[PDB]
Amino acid sequence: CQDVVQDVPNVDVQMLELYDRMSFKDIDGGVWKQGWNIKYDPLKYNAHHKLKVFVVPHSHNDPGWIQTFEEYYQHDTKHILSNALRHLHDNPEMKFIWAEISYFARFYHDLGENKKLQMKSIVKNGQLEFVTGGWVMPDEANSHWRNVLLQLTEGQTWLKQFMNVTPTASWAIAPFGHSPTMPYILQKSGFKNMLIQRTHYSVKKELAQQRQLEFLWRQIWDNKGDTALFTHMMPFYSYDIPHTCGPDPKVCCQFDFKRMGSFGLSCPWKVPPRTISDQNVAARSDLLVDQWKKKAELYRTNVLLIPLGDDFRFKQNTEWDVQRVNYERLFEHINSQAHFNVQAQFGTLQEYFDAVHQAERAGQAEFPTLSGDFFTYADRSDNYWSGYYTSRPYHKRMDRVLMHYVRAAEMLSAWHSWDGMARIEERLEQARRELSLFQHHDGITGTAKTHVVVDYEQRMQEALKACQMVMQQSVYRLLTKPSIYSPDFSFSYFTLDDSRWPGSGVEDSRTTIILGEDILPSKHVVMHNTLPHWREQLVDFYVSSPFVSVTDLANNPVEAQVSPVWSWHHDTLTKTIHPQGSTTKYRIIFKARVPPMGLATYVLTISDSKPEHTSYASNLLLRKNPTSLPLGQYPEDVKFGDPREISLRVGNGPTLAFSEQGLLKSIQLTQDSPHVPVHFKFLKYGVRSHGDRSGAYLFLPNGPASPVELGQPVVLVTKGKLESSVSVGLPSVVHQTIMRGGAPEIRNLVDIGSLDNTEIVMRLETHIDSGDIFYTDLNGLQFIKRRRLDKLPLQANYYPIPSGMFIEDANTRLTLLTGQPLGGSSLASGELEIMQDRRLASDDERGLGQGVLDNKPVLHIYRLVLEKVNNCVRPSKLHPAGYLTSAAHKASQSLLDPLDKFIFAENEWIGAQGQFGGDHPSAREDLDVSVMRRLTKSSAKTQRVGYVLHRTNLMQCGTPEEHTQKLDVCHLLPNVARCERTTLTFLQNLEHLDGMVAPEVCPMETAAYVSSHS
Ligand SMILES: *[C@@H]1O[C@H](CO)[C@@H](O)[C@H](O)[C@H]1NC(C)=O
Ligand SMILES: OC[C@H]1O[C@H](O)[C@@H](O)[C@@H](O)[C@@H]1O
Ligand SMILES: [Zn+2]
């Protein structure tokens, strides 16, 4: 395996280094506003060296943005595709590329067989070419890599089945900045080329000056270069026609033949297009070829890419005609006039790349190597697109919940073959497709209109229900004696219990386990562990009595803690935010121990009085002017006091100290170690009263954040043997620190209410000497080094925090792991901050046509890990990556893939079993089975199961780290007949594996395997 820690890759362009050197001056470059006046040597091209130009027609179709997916399909996309089919069929030299398979699948399935065949023919003959072939064109900032892969697989699996093609070139013209997670996944999914567009204007200028817009993009840790993927970055401000023919949009706009008037479009630069005729073609061609030759100066080969399209283009027949006929006249003239030395034609993206690489192999070009990312994007001036790292955070959190439920549903149901009547494949496809749709660059990004966000939410809610149905049917089958198992595929044998979604204070959604002498003495519950190692985790359930004890299915008592159910209320009468306790519902908490990729059953039983193995938390309400807080049968009376500093310790874990406002002030790791200052604070950013306003996309703060005025908040302290917590009702946030014996969990119930033009940030202040360095993750896959740059404005120093961030010095590191993607930064040495929500009254001029005023309460979850790192083997100071410790990685897994909890619905479970998966291998902690998916329906003689295995890289810090078993996924199911390594989408077999044994992957590698079973 490659060493991903100790060898700093030698690349031509390393983006962090480039950022350190660049001046980012925003000067008027002339007609190319953010570039310079491009000059070329007319004698560069001649009879023996011509400029090859590929004009590539396209239509950018958003699966939801200002209309819903279905609205756009009905109004626009179905017409675009129907007219594409017609106009391509009738014009054999015309070409068209298509990206969004969600739309294409919708269209194709509605076609009559005659048209289906015509469509297959124009694909087979290369007129219509699929680019990327994902369900969507995903966001790259907020998306988890698992969901990027999911949506890619959904689209490509559809394309293989119905169109018999698998794209090897990717087209990403629209996401707001670009992540190296994309080439990572694409290169492991058969791709050979990719195209990107939305990079900072200063980066485009810098790379253009060096002809480094085409590069071999490798991962930041990759010393050898095996991850490299050829990447083309477009040079100009937009992907529209005015910014794709050449540097001067006043000229290029004249070659968008949709802008002459009858289509309701015009040219902002005030020179309209004119129909190409015999009397103007020479003059028109002269202007156009001049633009092309200028664009060609920015690249290294004699092959030029000219995209020809815009949003929802090629909709009307008249539009197809006007673009095609005018370009055909230009091509006929240009190609016939030797003095131009140009050969121009309609082409596809693959044709462009094939020609570039032909030129490369002819020796006319060498391409530079590059590592790094392309965040944070700015399209002009100080307009940095860091707002969408946080916008619509409820749905950002929902994404992560559904991510896990899809994984769990696919894994749980993969163990068996299911009859068609069970509707398992149907529900899983629904769930995969809704989650995939939300990866769209207007979905998870929070940049869609309110009614579109509602549509995405409804879709995801349906997906969650689908997942629950599949999971609970699977649990019942896996844990019932086979000769007793008698499924009703419509019945709910179990109800999922999720303690953190939608969450306490967000939705009263969870079922109370109702026990009683005169109703039901006991209840079975089941935990699922999707991770491939034995796992313990505290789990909680609501119960109707405090006198409940827990046993495993061997009837061994399990230590439990009962706590009250506390609900926070904004008291409109007293004008205070304070907790109310239930007098009929209680929380029972215990440690579940669950096999790798397995299930464990426990029983909750009521008694008349305090059970031997159940303890009761104490509760202390700190406030002036307290009132009583009765708790029914709960055996310990609530205590009251004036606000005061408090300290808590659970188990042998850290000791945490809190301010009188209920906010963390210090962490002490061991009994005789220092009390390390770690201070939580909440602050607010505002919006500018003059100039550009923040909106869904842009973060344009009116200076550094100002502290939230806290008043004298009510603090609730719960102290238990298994779990303790401090909760405080702050303005807009119920902030909770929970301790279970390791790194604390933080939960914020964020309700920004009617606070217009406000962004609420949570900041951590420490004494870590981090300087200007911090680390943030990319797509939950890798951690990249960031450097705060005071030469850039505040909003430029904000980065996506899709799963975590950290700061460190020689001795100490603080890592904050997240259960949802949000924006964040380190704006001063020793600080971390992460945005919670934003409510913005104005539009930010990027097309949305609304602010963000549809906020709703959201429960954000985190883990906070303070560690000594003086003994850790870390990368050198020049390495662009960072890596988590074991503790931080496990903390991230606790947030993203917690145990699933199932409550048996009926009174008695006949044939119940205690465990599933006790014989599954318990793999090394850095390995995950990211995907387990049965690939075949029940009628297939040879069953196939696909696995995606990911190995992260964890820091070596002197812990022996012992006793784990080799995980061979190909032997997880019996009767293996073949094991194959495949692309990550499962669509191509790459290796036939000796002995049917799937080897474990290297650090930072992801591999896919398919086992076949007789
Ligand atoms: C699918 O495409 C391959 C070439 O990539 C071709 O050989 C094969 O016949 C096609 N399969 C069918 C029948 O669709
Ligand atoms: O300005 C951002 C905006 O650009 C275009 O209009 C669309 O493709 C949207 O997907 C995107 O949100
Ligand atoms: Zn778009």
HEC letters along 596-650 = CCEEEEEEEEECCCCCCCEEECEEEEECCCCCCCCCCCCCCCCEEECCCCEEEEC
696 CB-near residues (< 8 Å, 6+ apart): 387, 388, 391, 392, 446, 447, 840, 844, 846, 848, 850, 851, 852
Q: Mark 387-402 as b/e (b = at least 16 C-beta within 10 Å).
A: bbbbbbbbbbbbbbbb
Kindly state the tokens that stand for 718. 């719960």
Among the atoms of ligand 2, which is closest to the Cα of residue 846?
A: 1
Answer whether 174 contacts ligand 2 (Cβ < 6 A): yes
Domains 1-381 and 382-492 agree in fold: no
**Dihedral sign from CA coordinates of 254, 256, 262, 264:** negative
Look at the block and give the residue holding tokens 């779990």.
723
Answer whether 103 contacts ligand 2 (Cβ < 6 A): no
Chain CA centroid to CA 876, Å:
29
123 alpha carbon, closest ligand: 1
Size of the chain, expressed as the number of residues it contains = 1014
CA distances from 799 to 145, 172, 720, 979, 996 (A): 17, 20, 38, 41, 43
Answer whether 237 contacts ligand 2 (Cβ < 6 A): no
CA 186 – CA 182 distance, rounded (Å): 6
Q: Considering only the top CATH level, what class is 493-617+898-919?
A: mainly beta
Q: Which CATH superfamily is domain 1-381 in?
A: Glycoside hydrolase 38, N terminal domain (3.20.110.10)
CA 796 – CA 299 distance, rounded (Å): 28
Method: X-ray
Alpha helices in 26-174 (DSSP H): 69-72, 78-90, 101-110, 113-124, 145-163
CA 214 – CA 842 distance, rounded (Å): 38
Among the atoms of ligand 2, which is closest to the Cα of residue 440?
A: 10
CB 64 within 8 A of CB 455: yes
Helices 281-296 & 317-336 angle (0-180, nearest 10)? 80
CA 725 – CA 435 distance, rounded (Å): 33
431 CA to centre of ligand 3 in angstroms: 23
Question: What CATH architecture does domain 920-1014 belong to?
Answer: Sandwich (2.60)
CA distances from 151 to 105, 133, 927, 937, 991 (A): 13, 9, 23, 21, 24
312 CA to centre of ligand 3 in angstroms: 9
Resolution for this PDB entry, in angstroms: 1.3
Helices 101-110 & 424-438 angle (0-180, nearest 10)? 130
Q: What is the dihedral of CA 844, 134, 981, 1004, to 10 degrees?
A: 0
- Judged on CB neighbours under 10 Å (0-12, 13-18, 19+), 443 is buried
Domain 618-897 fold is Beta-galactosidase; Chain A, domain 5 (2.70.98)
Kindly state the tokens that stand for 322. 């006007």
Read off φ and ψ for residue 186, nearest 5 degrees: -60, -45
CA 702 – CA 688 distance, rounded (Å): 5
Q: Which helix (H) or strand (E) holds 430?
A: helix 424-438
Answer whether 139 contacts ligand 2 (Cβ < 6 A): no
Answer whether 643 contacts ligand 2 (Cβ < 6 A): no
Among the atoms of ligand 2, which is closest to the Cα of residue 445?
A: 12
716 CB-near residues (< 8 Å, 6+ apart): 566, 579, 619, 620, 621, 622, 662, 725, 726, 727, 728
CA triple 505-507-511, angle to 5 deg? 110
Among the atoms of ligand 2, which is closest to the Cα of residue 447?
A: 12
Q: Domain extents for the chain?
A: 1-381, 382-492, 493-617+898-919, 618-897, 920-1014
Kindly state the tokens that stand for 660. 């009188």
Other beta carbons within 10 Å of 904: 23
CA 365 – CA 883 distance, rounded (Å): 36
By most ligand atoms within 8 Å of CB, the mutation choice from 60, 69, 379, 846 for ligand 2 is 846
CA 3 – CA 683 distance, rounded (Å): 41
- Residue located nearest, by CA, to atom 2 of ligand 2: 846
837 CA to centre of ligand 2 in angstroms: 22
Kindly state the tokens that stand for 107. 């269209």
Side chain identity at residue 125, one-letter code: N
CA distances from 29 to 209, 239, 419, 698 (A): 13, 19, 65, 24
Side chain identity at residue 923, one-letter code: A
Which of 788, 787, 824 has its CA nearest to residue 804?
A: 824
Q: How many helices (H) and strands (E) does the chain have?
A: 16, 48
CA 726 – CA 716 distance, rounded (Å): 6
828 CB-near residues (< 8 Å, 6+ apart): none
CA 592 – CA 740 distance, rounded (Å): 13
Answer whether 844 contacts ligand 2 (Cβ < 6 A): no
Q: Mark 289-308 as b/e (b = at least 16 C-beta within 10 Å).
A: bbbbbbbbbbbbbbbbbbbb
CB 453 within 8 A of CB 854: yes
CA 127 – CA 119 distance, rounded (Å): 10
125 CA to centre of ligand 1 in angstroms: 12
Answer whether 447 contacts ligand 2 (Cβ < 6 A): yes
**Dihedral sign from CA coordinates of 27, 29, 33, 34:** negative
Answer whether 65 contacts ligand 2 (Cβ < 6 A): yes
Q: Which helix (H) or strand (E) holds 18?
A: helix 15-21
CA 301 – CA 214 distance, rounded (Å): 10
By most ligand atoms within 8 Å of CB, the mutation choice from 391, 392, 442, 852 for ligand 2 is 442
Which of 283, 279, 207 has its CA nearest to residue 251?
A: 283
Kindly state the tokens that stand for 297. 């100066």
| Terminal Cα distance for the chain, rounded | 33
CATH node for 382-492:
1.20.1270.50
Answer whether 240 contacts ligand 2 (Cβ < 6 A): no
**Dihedral sign from CA coordinates of 398, 401, 405, 406:** positive
